[PDB]
Amino acid sequence: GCLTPLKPVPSAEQLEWHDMEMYAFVHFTINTFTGKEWGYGDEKPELFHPSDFDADDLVRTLADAGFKGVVLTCKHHDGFCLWPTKTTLHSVAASPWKQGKGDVVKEVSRACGKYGVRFGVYLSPWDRNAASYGTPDYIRMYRQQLKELATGYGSIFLAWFDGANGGDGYYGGARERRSIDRSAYYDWKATWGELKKRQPGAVIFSDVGPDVRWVGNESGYAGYPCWATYTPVPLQAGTEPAPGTVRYRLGTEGTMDGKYWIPAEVDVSIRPGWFWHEHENSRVRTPENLLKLYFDSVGRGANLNLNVPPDRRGRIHEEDKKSLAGFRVLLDELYSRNFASGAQAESSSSWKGHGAEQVLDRKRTTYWVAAPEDKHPCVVLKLPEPAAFDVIRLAEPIQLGQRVRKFRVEVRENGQWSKWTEGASIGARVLLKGRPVTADGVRVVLEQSRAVPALCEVSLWKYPVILNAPAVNYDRNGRVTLASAENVVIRYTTDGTEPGPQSAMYRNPFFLPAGGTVKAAAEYRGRKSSVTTQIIPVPTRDWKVVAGERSAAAPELAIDGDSSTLWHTHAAQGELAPPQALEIDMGRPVNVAAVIYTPRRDSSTGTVDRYAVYLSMDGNTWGAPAAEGEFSNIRANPVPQRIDLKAPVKARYLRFVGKRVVEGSHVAVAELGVLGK
Ligand SMILES: [Ca+2]
Ligand SMILES: [Ca+2]
């Protein structure tokens, strides 16, 4: 079955790149040691002194996360080079890292070889230290740097050519603004030709790059359809397309029937900034985020390039490693069971031996092709029994072209077929997520295509369960109800320990008539979730309101357990001013140790700041205040406030006196509770 291709087609190196699916950035240079996202160029190389670098750890941590390549920023915009280049001493050769000089590029490419992951380079065309930048001599220097990187560090699978500029820089002390004709300065054709002479197996990235294109954003999403084909058009009509001179937002979806084959890379950072920042340790993308990113990039037909910036300790930070390990666990669960492996494949037609069955081995080299006859080609998978799934994966033999243009996927439930998902492009691969179904039949219908269609993979998958922390709710009876999105086991503790994997399971609403602390956690297939911790106050069903201004709002709205219900003293007669008091008969002698005041959410009107609480056992003699003070920072942060008693008191009657407020001049209590440890 030697079938006729559909121009354009990818090359062998582009096919390998596609099959990689995903790979990593490592933004690491002197800016990592300045705190800047873009360096100026005046940095002393003294400042590149990573304490405890270790490249094996770096590459291994990335490879365990499933990334198949590492792209190192060998020189970023600041112009400082991570290897002892012969073009400048604004390199590691000047740094105290190592006795004078080591070589980060050598170590990272060596570890990439050590762990079977590809190695690629980023060499910023815009050099902000080279005093020759703007003159042809900088082009000579840049060509020598590219030769050095492409001569002594093994195979390079991708070279990353950033088209971004921005003008000013140190430029060897010039401290000047320089601009270059981006569409002609770097003379890209010859530089890239020489590079691909000494690295025939490499792939060129840039906004136009003859091999891989930029997705046109840095937020981490390609657009569906994300055609691999692409025809760059310039920003300024007439100029010649080049990195930084093309309508780049068009690179988010590609071009329908393009003239060239430049598939898309989704470069995105695990953190807001491309380089390591300490104040971003709390903003590292969660594994669920990274999986969503994986779909919105890989599962749309593009490839993923996640940036993991080593800190200025020279290591991937602990948060980054935690998130990467979680992301690997989630990708592994996603591909635990292929609900198509074991199925039968049928087709509306076939051509010269490429039968339907050929889509079950997931291999991109074996494929089904329809006959140039039926205008509605289709592929049916029949399953051994109804199976629970929600994700389909489709793939084309892209080496023969990209053919599918509009397509749908129908599922068979309860004996009947209904439409489940649809789309436009397939290309390298597409992950379609639909409604969760229990089905034993899948139909892929290729509605329209320019050339006789073909598929190399049809596989079925269950999207991993998002383990959201358990909701812990309670009524005025102490009846506690735990809940979560379905199909999760919930463990819980009431003493104060953390919910270990051997803690009490949740089953039905349980009781806690003393007031305490609940800590719950969700579980599914060995993977845990965040721990919800909730303090349950004492029951309030025997509580009656003994004293409190009624002519405006019913005081029972402050002990009804609903924070969205409001007691106030803002009657149509007047804004009756503080102090406003609530005397509560608790119905039973309670051993109170804390008082909870829940203010209103939407406003700061009526919220109290200075408070007094009296306790008694007859409601007639109160005495000195049982507690006393202010609610510091309740204006900007109106949340439930806790009055811890200096010493626990046993009492039946409680008087809460709001003495004065934050804004307005009536008192407003949303809820009022009591804790008795
Ligand atoms: Ca196949
Ligand atoms: Ca209330």
Side-chain angles (χ1 to χ4, degrees):
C2 185
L3 191 275
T4 178
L6 190 280
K7 293 181 175 68
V9 296
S11 66
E13 295 85 5
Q14 287 177 350
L15 292 171
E16 295 184 356
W17 177 77
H18 276 287
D19 296 341
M20 293 182 72
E21 284 191 356
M22 67 181 184
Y23 54 91
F25 258 113
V26 177
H27 281 276
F28 183 61
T29 188
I30 202 164
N31 296 324
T32 299
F33 303 26
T34 64
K36 295 168 71 74
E37 286 290 324
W38 289 356
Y40 189 72
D42 56 348
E43 291 87 358
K44 295 296 294 295
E46 301 175 355
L47 293 171
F48 182 75
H49 186 72
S51 66
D52 189 359
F53 169 59
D54 187 357
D56 285 333
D57 188 4
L58 189 284
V59 174
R60 190 270 305 276
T61 301
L62 294 176
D64 292 342
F67 292 103
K68 297 183 185 69
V70 173
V71 177
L72 180 64
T73 65
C74 298
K75 186 186 74 176
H76 193 266
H77 298 297
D78 54 352
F80 165 57
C81 300
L82 290 178
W83 76 97
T85 184
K86 305 288 99 172
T87 65
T88 180
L89 262 67
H90 196 254
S91 65
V92 294
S95 62
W97 183 63
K98 267 54 186 298
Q99 299 304 109
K101 180 258 285 185
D103 186 353
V104 178
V105 177
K106 183 180 87 275
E107 298 185 358
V108 169
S109 64
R110 189 174 65 242
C112 286
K114 182 176 183 290
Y115 294 95
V117 297
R118 300 299 302 273
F119 180 72
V121 297
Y122 168 68
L123 187 66
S124 174
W126 178 49
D127 181 340
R128 206 186 291 189
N129 188 348
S132 62
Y133 186 76
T135 64
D137 190 73
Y138 173 75
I139 295 164
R140 194 274 311 158
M141 179 184 286
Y142 178 76
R143 288 179 174 176
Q144 185 175 2
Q145 287 182 350
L146 181 65
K147 180 181 176 183
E148 288 171 348
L149 291 177
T151 298
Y153 296 100
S155 296
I156 304 303
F157 76 103
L158 187 149
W160 215 81
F161 294 97
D162 197 358
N165 192 355
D168 55 353
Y170 180 74
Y171 300 112
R175 291 184 179 276
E176 188 183 7
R177 179 176 181 80
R178 296 177 185 176
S179 69
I180 50 90
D181 190 353
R182 292 185 179 96
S183 64
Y185 178 72
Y186 298 104
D187 190 5
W188 285 114
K189 184 175 174 66
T191 300
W192 288 342
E194 187 66 25
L195 180 59
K196 185 173 280 283
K197 290 179 184 291
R198 65 177 65 92
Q199 290 287 321
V203 165
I204 300 300
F205 176 82
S206 72
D207 301 337
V208 185
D211 297 329
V212 174
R213 71 178 185 268
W214 181 53
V215 63
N217 66 13
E218 289 179 352
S219 298
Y221 70 97
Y224 192 73
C226 186
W227 307 102
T229 57
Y230 188 69
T231 60
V233 295
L235 288 174
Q236 295 175 356
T239 64
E240 306 302 326
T245 63
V246 291
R247 296 177 66 196
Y248 69 92
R249 293 180 189 271
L250 290 177
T252 303
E253 284 187 351
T255 63
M256 184 73 73
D257 299 333
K259 186 183 286 185
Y260 296 105
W261 184 272
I262 309 103
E265 169 184 353
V266 172
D267 53 348
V268 64
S269 173
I270 195 167
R271 299 193 182 192
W274 290 96
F275 301 12
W276 182 77
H277 301 284
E278 185 173 0
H279 70 277
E280 289 186 358
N281 292 324
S282 66
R283 293 182 69 196
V284 178
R285 293 176 180 270
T286 67
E288 302 84 7
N289 190 1
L290 291 175
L291 182 64
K292 185 176 175 68
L293 191 72
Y294 176 79
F295 281 10
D296 294 329
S297 61
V298 173
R300 293 179 190 262
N303 281 311
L304 181 60
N305 188 354
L306 189 68
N307 181 17
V308 180
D311 59 0
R312 60 192 71 186
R313 191 170 65 245
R315 290 192 183 276
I316 295 172
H317 190 268
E318 290 78 1
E319 290 290 332
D320 297 335
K321 286 181 177 177
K322 187 173 180 178
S323 294
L324 289 175
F327 175 64
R328 181 62 176 171
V329 169
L330 273 303
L331 284 174
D332 289 337
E333 177 174 358
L334 177 62
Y335 296 112
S336 294
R337 185 174 174 180
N338 179 358
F339 290 93
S341 62
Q344 288 178 354
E346 188 69 27
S347 66
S348 65
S349 66
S350 66
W351 182 77
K352 298 291 184 182
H354 295 286
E357 63 181 3
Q358 302 291 321
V359 300
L360 290 169
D361 58 358
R362 290 189 63 190
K363 294 196 289 183
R364 188 260 306 161
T365 183
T366 59
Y367 48 89
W368 167 69
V369 296
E373 295 175 355
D374 57 348
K375 284 88 173 65
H376 296 91
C378 181
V379 170
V380 182
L381 291 179
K382 183 174 184 179
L383 280 70
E385 65 174 356
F389 65 94
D390 62 5
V391 175
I392 189 170
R393 180 183 170 99
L394 292 82
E396 291 179 355
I398 60 172
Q399 68 272 14
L400 295 173
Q402 189 175 6
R403 300 185 182 185
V404 173
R405 298 289 184 268
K406 181 69 72 176
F407 82 124
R408 68 178 184 269
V409 174
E410 302 176 355
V411 295
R412 185 261 184 88
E413 284 179 349
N414 296 319
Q416 303 296 322
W417 287 90
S418 71
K419 187 252 283 180
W420 178 56
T421 185
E422 61 188 1
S425 68
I426 301 293
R429 84 297 297 261
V430 58
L431 293 171
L432 289 171
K433 179 173 170 63
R435 68 185 189 273
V437 297
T438 301
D440 54 356
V442 175
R443 277 202 287 267
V444 176
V445 178
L446 303 174
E447 294 180 354
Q448 191 263 327
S449 296
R450 282 181 61 243
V452 60
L455 274 70
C456 67
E457 180 183 3
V458 179
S459 63
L460 301 174
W461 309 100
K462 175 68 180 71
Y463 186 72
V465 178
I466 305 95
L467 274 79
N468 294 320
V472 178
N473 293 318
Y474 61 91
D475 64 1
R476 296 179 66 189
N477 290 318
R479 183 180 175 90
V480 185
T481 299
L482 280 69
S484 179
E486 75 276 15
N487 192 0
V488 295
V489 172
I490 298 172
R491 292 190 183 275
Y492 80 122
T493 61
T494 184
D495 54 359
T497 63
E498 295 298 326
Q502 304 85 15
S503 294
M505 183 177 175
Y506 182 77
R507 71 286 185 193
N508 288 316
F510 69 94
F511 288 96
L512 195 152
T517 301
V518 174
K519 292 181 182 291
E523 294 177 353
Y524 173 69
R525 193 182 292 181
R527 180 175 64 249
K528 195 175 182 179
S529 74
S530 180
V531 174
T532 299
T533 180
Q534 179 67 42
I535 296 171
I536 296 170
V538 301
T540 59
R541 181 195 69 245
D542 292 331
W543 292 8
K544 282 88 170 65
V545 176
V546 166
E549 178 68 28
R550 194 172 302 278
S551 66
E556 293 86 10
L557 297 179
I559 58 170
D560 60 355
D562 190 2
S563 63
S564 68
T565 62
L566 285 74
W567 176 72
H568 56 88
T569 63
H570 184 274
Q573 289 77 12
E575 185 177 0
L576 189 63
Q580 295 295 322
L582 270 67
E583 295 179 354
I584 297 297
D585 185 358
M586 294 180 185
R588 180 176 289 173
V590 176
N591 191 359
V592 54
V595 173
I596 297 170
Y597 167 76
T598 302
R600 65 183 298 163
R601 299 296 91 191
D602 58 358
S603 176
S604 294
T605 304
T607 301
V608 68
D609 62 359
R610 187 174 183 178
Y611 72 91
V613 57
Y614 303 97
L615 296 175
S616 180
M617 296 179 286
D618 60 356
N620 289 318
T621 179
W622 296 102
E628 58 191 2
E630 291 281 331
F631 283 162
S632 65
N633 195 1
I634 193 167
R635 176 180 288 273
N637 195 2
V639 293
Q641 305 293 321
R642 180 175 177 177
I643 299 93
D644 286 330
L645 288 175
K646 294 169 96 287
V649 176
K650 288 177 70 69
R652 188 179 180 181
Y653 297 95
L654 183 148
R655 185 178 180 181
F656 173 72
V657 174
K659 293 175 72 174
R660 59 193 64 191
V661 298
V662 177
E663 203 274 333
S665 179
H666 64 273
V667 175
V669 179
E671 281 290 327
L672 185 65
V674 167
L675 290 172
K677 186 172 175 66

